[PDB]
Design an enzyme around this catalytic site. Structure first.
Site, PDB file in Angstrom:
ATOM      1  N   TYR A  48       0.825  -1.206   0.000  1.00  0.00           N
ATOM      2  CA  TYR A  48       0.000   0.000   0.000  1.00  0.00           C
ATOM      3  C   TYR A  48       0.857   1.253   0.000  1.00  0.00           C
ATOM      4  O   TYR A  48       0.482   2.264  -0.606  1.00  0.00           O
ATOM      5  CB  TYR A  48      -0.983   0.026   1.170  1.00  0.00           C
ATOM      6  CG  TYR A  48      -2.284  -0.664   0.860  1.00  0.00           C
ATOM      7  CD1 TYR A  48      -3.341   0.037   0.276  1.00  0.00           C
ATOM      8  CD2 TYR A  48      -2.460  -2.023   1.124  1.00  0.00           C
ATOM      9  CE1 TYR A  48      -4.526  -0.590  -0.028  1.00  0.00           C
ATOM     10  CE2 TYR A  48      -3.636  -2.657   0.821  1.00  0.00           C
ATOM     11  CZ  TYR A  48      -4.673  -1.944   0.248  1.00  0.00           C
ATOM     12  OH  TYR A  48      -5.836  -2.606  -0.037  1.00  0.00           O
ATOM     13  N   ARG A 127      -7.304  -3.143  -5.333  1.00  0.00           N
ATOM     14  CA  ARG A 127      -7.160  -2.993  -3.888  1.00  0.00           C
ATOM     15  C   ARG A 127      -8.342  -2.266  -3.257  1.00  0.00           C
ATOM     16  O   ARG A 127      -9.024  -2.828  -2.395  1.00  0.00           O
ATOM     17  CB  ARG A 127      -5.823  -2.336  -3.507  1.00  0.00           C
ATOM     18  CG  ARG A 127      -4.597  -3.272  -3.630  1.00  0.00           C
ATOM     19  CD  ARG A 127      -4.780  -4.675  -3.034  1.00  0.00           C
ATOM     20  NE  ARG A 127      -5.348  -4.665  -1.699  1.00  0.00           N
ATOM     21  CZ  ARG A 127      -5.685  -5.760  -1.027  1.00  0.00           C
ATOM     22  NH1 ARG A 127      -5.386  -6.964  -1.483  1.00  0.00           N
ATOM     23  NH2 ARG A 127      -6.352  -5.642   0.116  1.00  0.00           N
ATOM     24  N   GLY A 135     -13.928  -5.684   2.819  1.00  0.00           N
ATOM     25  CA  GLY A 135     -13.081  -5.549   3.994  1.00  0.00           C
ATOM     26  C   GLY A 135     -13.815  -5.846   5.286  1.00  0.00           C
ATOM     27  O   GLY A 135     -13.249  -6.432   6.211  1.00  0.00           O
TER      28      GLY A 135
HETATM   29  C1  COH Z   1     -13.418 -14.135   2.020  1.00  0.00           C
HETATM   30  C2  COH Z   1     -13.505 -12.833   1.853  1.00  0.00           C
HETATM   31  C3  COH Z   1     -12.780 -12.198   0.729  1.00  0.00           C
HETATM   32  C4  COH Z   1     -11.436 -12.449   0.257  1.00  0.00           C
HETATM   33  C5  COH Z   1     -10.385 -13.412   0.730  1.00  0.00           C
HETATM   34  C6  COH Z   1     -11.366 -11.491  -0.855  1.00  0.00           C
HETATM   35  C7  COH Z   1     -10.131 -11.422  -1.580  1.00  0.00           C
HETATM   36  C8  COH Z   1      -9.865 -10.344  -2.493  1.00  0.00           C
HETATM   37  C9  COH Z   1      -8.520 -10.152  -3.022  1.00  0.00           C
HETATM   38  C10 COH Z   1      -7.316 -10.944  -2.684  1.00  0.00           C
HETATM   39  C11 COH Z   1      -6.392 -11.247  -3.579  1.00  0.00           C
HETATM   40  C12 COH Z   1      -8.635  -9.019  -3.903  1.00  0.00           C
HETATM   41  C13 COH Z   1      -7.587  -8.352  -4.718  1.00  0.00           C
HETATM   42  C14 COH Z   1     -10.071  -8.716  -3.770  1.00  0.00           C
HETATM   43  C15 COH Z   1     -10.628  -7.647  -4.558  1.00  0.00           C
HETATM   44  C16 COH Z   1     -12.048  -7.456  -4.649  1.00  0.00           C
HETATM   45  N1  COH Z   1     -12.956  -8.056  -3.862  1.00  0.00           N
HETATM   46 CO1  COH Z   1     -12.702  -9.387  -2.484  1.00  0.00          CO
HETATM   47  N2  COH Z   1     -12.445 -10.711  -1.104  1.00  0.00           N
HETATM   48  C17 COH Z   1     -13.287 -11.141  -0.142  1.00  0.00           C
HETATM   49  C18 COH Z   1     -14.609 -10.628   0.075  1.00  0.00           C
HETATM   50  C19 COH Z   1     -15.212  -9.776  -0.907  1.00  0.00           C
HETATM   51  C20 COH Z   1     -16.637  -9.487  -0.760  1.00  0.00           C
HETATM   52  C21 COH Z   1     -17.595  -9.929   0.307  1.00  0.00           C
HETATM   53  C22 COH Z   1     -16.878  -8.658  -1.914  1.00  0.00           C
HETATM   54  C23 COH Z   1     -18.175  -8.042  -2.342  1.00  0.00           C
HETATM   55  C24 COH Z   1     -18.829  -8.994  -3.344  1.00  0.00           C
HETATM   56  C25 COH Z   1     -19.039 -10.371  -2.768  1.00  0.00           C
HETATM   57  O1  COH Z   1     -18.548 -11.350  -3.369  1.00  0.00           O
HETATM   58  O2  COH Z   1     -19.704 -10.479  -1.719  1.00  0.00           O
HETATM   59  C26 COH Z   1     -15.554  -8.578  -2.567  1.00  0.00           C
HETATM   60  C27 COH Z   1     -15.395  -7.829  -3.796  1.00  0.00           C
HETATM   61  C28 COH Z   1     -14.097  -7.509  -4.322  1.00  0.00           C
HETATM   62  C29 COH Z   1     -13.964  -6.541  -5.410  1.00  0.00           C
HETATM   63  C30 COH Z   1     -15.023  -5.755  -6.123  1.00  0.00           C
HETATM   64  C31 COH Z   1     -15.566  -6.535  -7.316  1.00  0.00           C
HETATM   65  C32 COH Z   1     -16.454  -5.605  -8.120  1.00  0.00           C
HETATM   66  O3  COH Z   1     -17.548  -5.259  -7.624  1.00  0.00           O
HETATM   67  O4  COH Z   1     -16.064  -5.193  -9.236  1.00  0.00           O
HETATM   68  C33 COH Z   1     -12.547  -6.502  -5.636  1.00  0.00           C
HETATM   69  C34 COH Z   1     -11.766  -5.687  -6.616  1.00  0.00           C
HETATM   70  N3  COH Z   1     -14.554  -9.250  -1.968  1.00  0.00           N
HETATM   71  N4  COH Z   1     -10.815  -9.489  -2.935  1.00  0.00           N
END
Ligand code: COH
Ligand SMILES: [Cl-]
EC number: 1.14.14.18
Length: 210
Positions: A48, A127, A135
């Protein structure tokens, strides 16, 4: 489709794979502990910090200004979390970037030095929109499984944002409205895939030896 939808669809598989990372799935399901969460947050502070230098350079060039909201900055918030998690401030001069974080930081520094606006926006989406969107889920799992105090989870809360659902809607619209040549748009989409790979590799390094 608009850029926000294309970003979501083009990284959806990578997102699912991130949730199923051995390290991250172990962390989220309660098989690790506060120390491993702290190791993750230390690596995140390193990337970050580099990301926010790249954001600052791209914003100063006049590109994507409305998207690059300084209220999103996480590095100093993360440092306060880590002061609490580690019980002192010594970690600032002691932690070392894992090989994956070196690679990720190196790319962010290239984006900074090249003032590569489209590439920066891809990293910003991967991010910050992920932080804004997911988050709270991650923070709650650290609180529940490991007893992390909310005061050490500031990274997962955006103090400067009053209406989170509205902010996320407006963020996606800013992506949709960003003027991009065909080449810039393809560059941005590729970069978003690359940003997910770097983030996945961070987890792989954290999982070594477990
Ligand atoms: C287990 C919980 C978890 C993990 C490990 C995780 C791991 C990661 C990760 C690690 C490499 C990255 C770079 C991201 C990046 C994102 N996550 Co998450 N996410 C997580 C829970 C979520 C949740 C909750 C959302 C909202 C949409 C959903 O699937 O519920 C989410 C949505 C996103 C989005 C927005 C999508 C869109 O609306 O266009 C991005 C970008 N992300 N996430
Ligand atoms: Cl900061």
């Amino acid at each position: 489709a608009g850029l926000a939808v294309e970003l979501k669809q083009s990284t959806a598989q990578a997102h699912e794979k991130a949730e199923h990372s051995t390290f991250m799935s172990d962390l989220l399901k309660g098989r690790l502990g506060v120390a491993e969460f702290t190791r993750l947050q230390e690596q995140a502070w390193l990337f970050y910090t580099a990301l926010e230098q790249a954001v600052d350079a791209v914003r100063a060039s006049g590109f994507a200004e409305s998207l690059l909201d300084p209220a999103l900055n996480r590095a100093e918030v993360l440092a306060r979390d880590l002061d609490k998690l580690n019980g002192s401030s010594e970690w600032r001069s002691r932690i070392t970037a894992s090989p994956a974080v070196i690679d990720y930081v190196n790319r962010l520094e290239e984006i900074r030095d090249n003032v590569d606006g489209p590439a920066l926006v891809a990293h910003h989406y991967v991010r910050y929109l992920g932080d804004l969107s997911g988050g709270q889920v991650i923070a709650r799992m650290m609180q529940r499984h490991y007893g992390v105090d909310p005061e050490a989870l500031g990274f997962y809360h955006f103090e400067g944002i009053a209406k989170l659902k509205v902010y996320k809607d407006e963020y996606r619209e800013k992506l949709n409205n960003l003027e991009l040549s065909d080449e810039q748009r393809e560059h941005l989409l590729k970069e978003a895939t690359d940003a997910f790979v770097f983030n996945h590799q961070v987890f792989a390094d954290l999982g070594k030896g477990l």
